[PDB]
Ligand binder design. Structure first.
Ligand code: BEF
Ligand code: BEF
Ligand SMILES: [Mg+2]
Ligand SMILES: [Mg+2]
Lengths: 131, 131
């Protein structure tokens, strides 16, 4: 039933993530975006329950996408996934009411749990970044 | 089922919280402490699945009890419940790996849901304090 959008600029990771998401029993479909611009374009057109957003992407970052979602009052759940432990990225995401913030140090099983958590109206913040 | 400890120095609130908790079908027992020192004495004697801790109490604050629990590595989830939005309190709790941090502006139903969240191995922080 889950309609998922994955915005990630590294083709190999995006592809791998999306393939594994598609094999999940509760996942209906997975939209792909290579940057923040394609991400917003898809959110302007398609039904999306949850967006998994990389931070550092060309054209528009995942944080910009999150802010757009908030400014437009979309109810999309947003999970930021990033390699970066930069405090400013986290602070900016929290100010923008992100639902979850996950480092790419986490596993795919970890990510899956996170998705379930936010679908249930809960939040999850990288322990490393709460710090 | 769940063995709960409530440390809260306001008698009426502590009494009321504990009665409602005891009425929960999945609650086995509720221990009461009126200050931080009593809470530690009880934790040195009985097993507790979740400790619900007020911050400002006599002798030792709930933040000190939380740090004590963590230093003893007890298998005890800790939910801090407080009137106060002080950033220092919240920062101290997070550094000690608090499981949930809940303002007394929340409802008993909110608190109940929080108890299940931490037992499910997840965390919950007051939106106000995340800022
Ligand atoms: F490039 Be992402 F932020 F990992
Ligand atoms: F006194 Be408690 F911290 F509400
Ligand atoms: Mg990137
Ligand atoms: Mg008090």
């Amino acid at each position: 039933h889950m309609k998922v959008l994955v915005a990630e600029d590294q083709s190999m990771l995006r592809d791998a993530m999306c393939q594994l998401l598609t094999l999940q029993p509760d996942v209906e479909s997975v939209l792909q975006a290579k940057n923040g611009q394609e991400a917003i374009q898809l959110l302007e057109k398609e039904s999306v329950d949850i967006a998994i957003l990389d931070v550092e992407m060309p054209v528009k970052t995942g944080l910009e996408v999150l802010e757009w979602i908030r400014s437009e009052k979309l109810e999309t759940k947003v999970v930021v996934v990033t390699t970066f432990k930069r405090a400013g990225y986290f602070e900016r995401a929290v100010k923008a009411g992100v639902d979850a913030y996950v480092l790419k140090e986490r596993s795919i099983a970890d990510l899956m749990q996170t998705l379930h958590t936010v679908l249930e109206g809960r939040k999850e913040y990288s322990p490393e970044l709460m710090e």
